[PDB]
Amino acid sequence: DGMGEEFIEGLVRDSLYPPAG
Numbered sequence: 001d002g003m004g005e006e007f008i009e010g011l012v013r014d015s016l017y018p019p020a021g
Contacts, residue, residue, distance in 0.1 A: 001009045004016025 001015035001018050005014045009015035
């Protein structure tokens with residue numbers, strides 16, 4: 001994702017929640 005604090009978004013950093021639905 002970029003701006004978050006969940007976990008490494010594959011190849012970025014602490015993601016947030018891109019997938020929802």
